[PDB]
Design a protein around this ligand. Structure first.
Ligand SMILES: *[C@@H]1O[C@H](CO)[C@@H](O[C@@H]2O[C@H](CO)[C@@H](O)[C@H](O)[C@H]2NC(C)=O)[C@H](O)[C@H]1NC(C)=O
Ligand SMILES: *[C@@H]1O[C@H](CO)[C@@H](O)[C@H](O)[C@H]1NC(C)=O
Ligand SMILES: *[C@@H]1O[C@H](CO)[C@@H](O)[C@H](O)[C@H]1NC(C)=O
Ligand SMILES: *[C@@H]1O[C@H](CO)[C@@H](O)[C@H](O)[C@H]1NC(C)=O
Ligand SMILES: N[C@@H](CCC(=O)O)C(=O)O
Ligand SMILES: N[C@@H](CCC(=O)O)C(=O)O
Lengths: 414, 280, 403, 130, 79
């Protein structure tokens, strides 16, 4: 974070009132490619800089932080003249002599371990894929969904068909009014409490037997079908680990990248079977893990492969995204130091003692595991007023219909 | 690390499930629409039409019964025009109940439960002598996962003296019966034992949660010359993906304890408690 | 060796001009010149054979024809060149036949293949009998006998301190919920009798709606049309809407049809497409209705698809199965070392492993649909017989009253 | 879905309020009548003609109906929840199943002597455990 | 799932003279549709809810209620 005026860090407090601990970082400003780099003081804080202060007290040394020169992590690349290959970025500055302790998230692998000395891991991670979370969507605005509109008109028509036939059948049998029999069929369908006319002749009584059972089948099926749109509505478009077939054979409609000059590139080249999709990565690898995440939010990138300890912190605060897959390359972090250094033994014992005391389970609490958005716990669909409108307007907009009925009923009287 | 195992027979029930569908808003506006129809009915549709008296008390009661299925005898209002108006309200009730059950089925098909403890920092472990018949837990002595507890929680290490099993195999036998309710052991053998038990009867707290994460190793003799050669060999296996093959060959189980899909339940007295509180 | 390009088996890609050489994990394909890489399932087999046997080869794409066809004396394509001693082998997706094997001898098949049909997936459907299908005949066999017994008890006991017809309207109506006005007795014992039957009604109503919902959420997709034996494929002009189907000419799936159903073949000529990928847009656009091509390609093309809206008839029904193979020179004497090498891979799981690498995909499902009239039209027929039943009762009573 | 402990309280909870309703309405400006009133609501049967003339019984009757409705609706969900979520998994899913490569000495699996499964199994070294 | 796919086959001696015509009369039976008759006549012709069970608990109380009702009737008659 940029420094306040007078060069000091801004005063601050955490949620519990503890004053956060901050150091002074002297690093590059506006490190855009093709631009001059100017060094200005800044303010640094976070997980590792909270750990660094803890070591600096136990072992009794004194530090002086400074950000990396270019902003890369570390890999070996060939020089123009012959192949006197060398390291670059934050991994190369430790060997040169401009830095003595790489306090940062630095995976441990066989290529780097041959030149520098790592410590016991202070965090256990993996590699996982971050993909954009599509809208869960919802289909509930009108209640005409379970049945097609071609049936409700027919069902309403069938009510008048049966009702009129009670009067004809019962009266001809050697009585009840037809209008009285009209409310018999309507009463059954709506489960209402109005209507008193009932068939008397056994010819009409057997007619009313089945119609009572017809009303039960239609409504029960309707309320049964509405359960289908609450347990079946779910798409399935996600990547399953690394072995997903969509990743082995790239297509122009799918693009996926990583961060340039990191541990994943060393991983994707040491293997030989996966040498047909990495070649599509070399034209899209991004410059910083805090930028490729922003690109995904703009739909310019479909997949991202990075450390599982960062992609599961962004997936909580920026809950527009969700992480999918299974961890496929597990290697903890490490406070690397130059080979054959005097401090190389007491650092690896002041980390093993921070696991047991509950310390590194306490930094994990205050920085990485505070919750801001819930996760996708299946597809819970609670009912709100916005969903149901057609029912509410029919009762509200149907009360004015009764006004018209009064004016014509009294007109027939006179 | 250090992990916790539980019987999973109890788990956690879901109380107050009756108000899970709908919302607190739909019920509130249900009452006002329950009465606006009745108020107009007595004053307009029945009084201004030909054909003892239809009091307001019957209107609110009659219009109420159709909401929760008509079972109480009542007297319907007269008048031809008053008949249709009630039928319009009846069609509201038919859909109102139909959607409620449909939504209720969605919640209980994808029900999610919560574990009975939160970890070693919960009070059920720290101070057990304050509750119903006390919580039970125990661990195999003479290791690390008991040396770590003897330094940080020396208060509760005394309570664990009586409960001390004699290996993982014997303790997993007595965990189901009921002699003890929790087991504390390193989180790489509990995960395998959890994933290799018939019927998925045992689950691990947190579904893969470790509490003081320290790996394994090969304890070479001190000041040896092999240390730099062995380390490069092990760091090599991760890169080739060989370790991902050994983990699939040996450390694979049948039970998928990660999924929390509860295969239904038999609701008991405690589960349906909020309903009876409304009765009170 | 000779080779042609079939997309999932042999993929041809231009060589990278930066290094002037082919890429890693590929072999040169010198067309007939140029030079370019080529990789795939069939090519991956070729390297393994050259390892445990040992020989030198140089692929080259064939240009004379496509897969082989007879022009009354001459053969062209992969078979055409091998038969005329311009090559030795011909690896690829070369279907074993009879007309071919009379002149060049193949090897042991290593992929299964036949002829199948691909059609566009449509909206899901449920059985029309769903109103009563999920219920056993035993349920309604014993359901009504209980009703007849109870109605006899209440009327007979009503004498001790209510017509027969009044008992039918009252006791029965409780099963379908109380929504019809009824007459009830006022006896201290008769009131209790109605209560027992009422409880079973709630359970019956509760049980009915649950099973119909559960049965309909998960089910099996309804098929559209059977295999080529269907009358539509055999006799297309006998139906008012003419079905549209066709196949790619110049191959085994054309010569097989010509020698078995010449009546159909004379009708499919106007419905032709000159490719595979070109012809799968027609199905999406609705121009065609079905496709007829060798199964191993349609099964793969039904998985490497966006939306998974294409499925094959019979869920993978294969007709006239004949596998792939490697041609030879009719006397090759290389045959036995190749026959005994392919069978060794099946002893291991090396061939199975390859099928996961290339011949695999996603969406190897159910769809929710509105009921509509047709699906619930079955329950309407129950209503129709009831209306007819009233007429039978009406005529019987009228006649007996007269005399 | 509901254990016998529930049905122990159902038969008394409906009955206990019946006398209470008779107590409230009578002493404001019988037992048989109220018994049919409350029970009929639970079973949805239009039995008896007794009506809550007093306002106190009406408001209590109003909330009482809601108690019955939740019971019916909730119970239907439980029964529909069992059918979908019911699968005592016992399948083996073919080869590479851990129950098959590592025998439990109780899951005994066999084949036919000689034949071609034996020729297949012996050749692969990784299959020497089963 | 199937995990070792190898078709059937007629056996013959290593030097039999019929191998050129046995291996063809099978390659011609597949295309005539002949072996889709044998697959029908001999293999693919045989294909083998709430019900009465799971509900006998309420069935007995219907008669049980009848039995319980009859005994109380004598009390009603005597009273
Ligand atoms: C396999 O079939 C071929 C023909 O398809 C047979 O060749 C003929 O056999 C008859 C039998 O006597 C001879 O008269 C002919 O001269 C043969 N040649 C031709 C061109 O017809 C062959 O004999 C059959 N093989 C066996 C083992 O019977
Ligand atoms: C490491 O700690 C030990 C313990 O006292 C001490 O003797 C030694 O000097 C320390 N070395 C360094 C480099 O800090
Ligand atoms: C643990 O250590 C104690 C003390 O030496 C010993 O008596 C006991 O046998 C050891 N093992 C177990 C399983 O208790
Ligand atoms: C099939 O072969 C004939 C032979 O002349 C040719 O004319 C025709 O174009 C071929 N069909 C194609 C290439 O689709
Ligand atoms: N992993 C532990 C097991 C013993 C225990 O936890 O008691 C160890 O070997 O130290
Ligand atoms: N691939 C098969 C079939 C080709 C086709 O049907 O067009 C062959 O070459 O014989």
């Amino acid at each position: 974070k940029p420094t306040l005026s007078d060069g000091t860090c801004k005063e601050e407090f955490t949620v519990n009132g503890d004053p956060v601990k901050k150091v002074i970082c002297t690093g590059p400003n506006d490190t855009s490619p093709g631009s001059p780099r100017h060094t200005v003081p800044q303010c640094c804080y976070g997980f590792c800089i909270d750990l660094l202060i803890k070591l600096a007290r136990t072992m009794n040394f004194t530090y002086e932080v400074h950000l990396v020169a270019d902003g890369k992590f570390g890999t070996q690349e060939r020089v123009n003249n012959s192949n006197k290959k060398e390291w670059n970025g934050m991994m190369g500055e430790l060997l040169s002599g401009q830095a003595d302790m790489i306090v940062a998230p630095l995976t441990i692998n066989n290529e780097r371990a041959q030149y520098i000395e790592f410590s016991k891991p202070f965090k256990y991670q993996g590699l996982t894929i971050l993909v954009k979370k599509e809208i869960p969507r919802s289909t509930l605005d009108s209640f005409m969904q379970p049945f097609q509109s071609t049936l409700w008109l027919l069902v309403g028509l069938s009510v008048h068909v049966v009702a009129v036939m009670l009067y004809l059948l019962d009266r001809f049998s050697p009585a009840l009014t037809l209008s009285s029999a009209m409310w018999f069929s309507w009463g059954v369908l709506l489960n209402s409490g109005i209507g008193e006319g009932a068939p008397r002749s056994f010819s009409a009584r057997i007619l009313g037997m089945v119609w009572a059972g017809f009303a039960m089948i239609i409504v029960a099926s309707y309320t049964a079908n509405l359960a289908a749109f609450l347990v079946l509505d779910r798409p399935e478009e996600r990547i399953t680990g690394i072995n997903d077939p969509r990743l082995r054979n790239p297509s122009d409609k799918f693009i996926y990248a990583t961060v340039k000059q990191s541990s994943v590139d060393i991983y994707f080249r040491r293997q030989v079977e996966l040498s047909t999709m990495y070649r599509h990565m070399e034209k899209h690898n991004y410059e910083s893990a805090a930028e490729a995440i922003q690109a995904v939010r703009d739909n310019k990138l479909h997949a991202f492969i990075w450390d599982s300890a960062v992609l599961e912190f962004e997936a909580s605060q920026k809950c527009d995204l969700v992480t999918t897959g299974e961890l496929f390359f597990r290697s903890g972090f490490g406070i690397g130091m130059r080979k054959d250094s005097p401090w190389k033994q007491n650092v690896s014992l002041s980390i093993l003692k921070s696991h047991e005391n509950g310390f590194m389970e306490d930094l994990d609490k205050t920085w990485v595991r505070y919750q801001e958005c819930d996760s996708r716990s299946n597809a819970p669909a609670t009912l709100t007023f916005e969903n149901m409108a057609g029912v509410f307007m029919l009762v509200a907009g149907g009360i004015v219909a009764g006004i018209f009925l009064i004016f014509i009923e009294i007109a027939y009287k006179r | 690390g250090i992990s916790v195992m539980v019987s999973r027979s109890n788990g956690t029930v879901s109380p107050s499930a009756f108000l899970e569908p709908f919302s607190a808003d739909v019920w509130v506006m249900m009452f006002v629409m329950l009465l606006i129809v009745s108020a107009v009915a007595v004053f307009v549709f029945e009084y201004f039409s030909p054909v003892p008296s239809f009091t307001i008390g019957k209107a609110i009661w009659l219009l109420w019964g159709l909401v929760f299925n008509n079972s109480v005898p009542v007297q319907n209002p007269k008048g031809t025009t008053s008949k249709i108006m009630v039928s319009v309200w009846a069609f509201f009730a038919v859909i109102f109940l139909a959607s409620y059950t449909a939504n209720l089925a969605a919640f209980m098909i994808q029900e999610e439960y919560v574990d009975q403890v939160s970890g070693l920092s919960d009070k059920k472990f720290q101070r057990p002598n304050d509750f119903s018949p006390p919580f039970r837990f125990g661990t195999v002595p003479n290791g690390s996962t008991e040396r770590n507890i003897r330094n940080n929680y020396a208060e509760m290490h005394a309570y664990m003296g009586k409960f001390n099993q004699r290996g993982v195999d014997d303790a997993l036998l007595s965990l189901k019966t009921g002699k003890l309710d929790a087991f504390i052991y390193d989180a790489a053998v509990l995960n395998y034992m959890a994933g290799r038990d018939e019927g998925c009867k045992l689950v691990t707290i947190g579904s893969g949660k470790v509490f003081a994460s320290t790996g394994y190793g090969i304890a070479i003799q001190k000041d040896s010359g092999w240390k730099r050669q062995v380390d490069l060999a092990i760091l090599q296996l991760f890169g080739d993906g060989e370790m991902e093959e050994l983990e699939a060959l040996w450390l694979t189980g049948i039970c998928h304890n990660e999924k929390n899909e509860v295969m239904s339940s038999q609701l008991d007295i405690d589960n349906m408690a909020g309903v009876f509180y409304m009765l009170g | 060796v000779a080779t042609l390009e079939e997309r999932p088996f042999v993929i041809v890609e231009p060589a990278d001009p930066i290094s002037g050489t082919c890429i890693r994990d590929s072999v040169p394909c010198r067309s007939q010149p140029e030079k370019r890489c080529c990789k795939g399932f069939c090519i991956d087999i070729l390297k393994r054979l050259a390892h445990t046997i040992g020989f030198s080869y140089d692929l080259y794409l064939v240009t004379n024809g496509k897969h082989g066809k007879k022009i009354d004396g001459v053969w062209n394509g992969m078979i055409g060149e091998v038969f005329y001693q311009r090559a030795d082998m011909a690896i690829g997706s070369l279907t074993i036949n009879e007309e071919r094997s009379e002149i060049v001898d193949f090897s042991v098949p290593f992929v299964e293949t036949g002829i199948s049909v691909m059609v566009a997936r449509s909206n899901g459907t449920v059985s029309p009998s769903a109103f009563l299908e999920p219920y056993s005949p035993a349920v309604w066999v014993m359901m009504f006998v209980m009703c007849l017994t109870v109605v006899a008890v209440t009327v007979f006991i009503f004498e001790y301190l209510f017509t027969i017809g009044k008992s039918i309207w009252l006791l029965w109506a409780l099963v379908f919920n109380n929504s019809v006005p009824v007459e009830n007795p006022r006896g201290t014992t008769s009131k209790i009798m109605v209560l027992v039957w009422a409880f079973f009604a709630v359970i019956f109503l509760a049980s009915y709606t649950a099973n119909l919902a559960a049965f309909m959420i998960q089910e099996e997709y309804v098929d559209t049309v059977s295999g080529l034996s269907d009358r539509k494929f055999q006799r297309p002009q006998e139906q008012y809407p003419p079905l549209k189907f066709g196949t790619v000419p110049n191959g085994s799936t054309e010569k097989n049809i010509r020698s078995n159903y010449p009546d159909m073949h004379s009708y499919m000529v106007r419905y032709n497409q000159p490719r595979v990928e070109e012809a799968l847009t027609q199905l999406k656009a609705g121009k065609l209705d079905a496709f007829i091509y060798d199964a191993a390609v349609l099964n793969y093309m039904a998985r490497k698809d966006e939306g998974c809206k294409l499925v094959t008839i019979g869920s993978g029904k294969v007709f006239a199965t004949t596998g792939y193979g490697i041609a030879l020179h009719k006397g090759s004497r290389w045959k036995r070392p190749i026959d005994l090498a392919l069978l060794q891979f099946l002893g291991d799981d090396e061939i199975e492993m390859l099928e996961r690498l290339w011949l695999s995909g996603i969406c190897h499902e159910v769809m929710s649909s509105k009921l509509d009239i047709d699906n619930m039209a079955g329950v309407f027929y129950m209503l129709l017989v009831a209306m007819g039943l009233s007429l039978l009762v009406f005529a019987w009573e009228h006649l007996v009253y007269w005399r």
